[PDB]
Symmetry: C2
Amino acid sequence: GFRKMAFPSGKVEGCMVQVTCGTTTLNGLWLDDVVYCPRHVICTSEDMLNPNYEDLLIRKSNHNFLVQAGNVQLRVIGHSMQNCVLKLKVDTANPKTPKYKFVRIQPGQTFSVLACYNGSPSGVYQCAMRPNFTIKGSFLNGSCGSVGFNIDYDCVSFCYMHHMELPTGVHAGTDLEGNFYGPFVDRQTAQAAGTDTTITVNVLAWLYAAVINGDRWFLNRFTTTLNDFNLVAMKYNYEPLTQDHVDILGPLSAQTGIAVLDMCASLKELLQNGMNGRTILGSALLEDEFTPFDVV
Amino acid sequence: GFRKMAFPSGKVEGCMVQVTCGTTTLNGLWLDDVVYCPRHVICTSEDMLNPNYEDLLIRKSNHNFLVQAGNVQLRVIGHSMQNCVLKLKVDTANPKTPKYKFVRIQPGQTFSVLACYNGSPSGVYQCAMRPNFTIKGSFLNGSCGSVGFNIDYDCVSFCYMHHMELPTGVHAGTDLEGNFYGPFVDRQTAQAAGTDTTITVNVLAWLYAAVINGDRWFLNRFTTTLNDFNLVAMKYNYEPLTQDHVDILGPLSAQTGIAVLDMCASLKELLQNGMNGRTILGSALLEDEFTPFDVVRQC
């Protein structure tokens, strides 16, 4: 918990391509002989109020789509839709295609984002899917989109594709089968995310991290109960805690000797009172974007 | 300036190898037909207090060094020391060598770090060189080193190579010509970094970013002198502002309508009042790891 690290992006950098239809250019993902991108790329400024993606797409032809892989143009030989992602079939398969799978994550899980600006991968950052199903991303100077992923050995797990900025600085998107995370639609219309909350089990995992790293000043002699803790949590805008969360933290409790409900008592008192001038793990903020697995 | 973003690491990943000497294995950088790595790889555990690097190196021959680029073994055909870096000549140039250059940075400047854990690249993060010439990196689960860079257009600027964790959590290292940043040496003797101060010019550039994104609540009607600002800033462990910092921010004060010394007056009030509970650019802390250059790119 020293610093929020992202996975190295190299395996993903060679899958990014630019996709143009009309005036709209944005980022696509090129795997085997298929390019994936948000289906809203076929829309024009006027289509976006309330489009019929079915209709507009049947009126589209292969030569309407310009796909650039660097300075190499890819010829589109087919297209289909799968929920909110358009699949463009291309003449050539990507020789840089890594071992990969598509997965869907849950709120509270973390991943790395390779962000597009000005038509190329330009930034990488680590983040978490919020409980309101948004991502607190960087959108400055707009964007050309982004892809979220994890690396598990040689295998890349793609878990997120960006579709839109929300009125707040946050982002919403889909998994790679085009299913949205959260209660959003890919139209131009009033949409606001639900209330965000702090991800409690990650905060706990992060305090476990500090104790391992020697920061121990917040421990106290007391315990609490799930029910007593959860009533305090809801008051402070923190997610409830379940027996599953307790189970998942069990390794950290057995390694450290601090029971989970004993550490919840520490977290309970940190809410009500605060850090004063002491810091945890060199940070004076409560971090909730480190998962248990991340602390390892 | 919402998220601290790092540069995509791929051009650097193709350059990381693994140098072994005796029982020590750590990360090296393979550019053209040279491998660069910390000279202390030739050190026995006994030698770390008072190592005689010239004595230790004259006693090595080329096949003492084991260089592995993933699965391939590279063959060492010569070696030389250049300050605190070992240069290992190998018989095959790296076919993945990017356009690159070696630059020495100054404190306050930012760069991305590709961190080696368990013999391979495994994490990437963005940081600044602190004014005491250390990095608040991340040291855990058996580091094998790291390499710092910026990417501009398509050229990689390599600026940092990690050598040691200091007894604090911070890390210290050299540029790629082997000169240490700061007053450190590559021996395990008592070394302590000077006080870490806040990089005043980066906070100001951040604040300008926040005005540009429409946050204005911290602004006040006052202005200050440079010498009065610096007198107050020092009592909070903020670096002093120089005239060069003022000029460098000029672009932002033009775009924004707020003079530099106007914005300093607002920073003075923030330090005196705290943020209450409010936030700037989403942050509840004053952020000092974005440079004016970083800020003028996004804004």
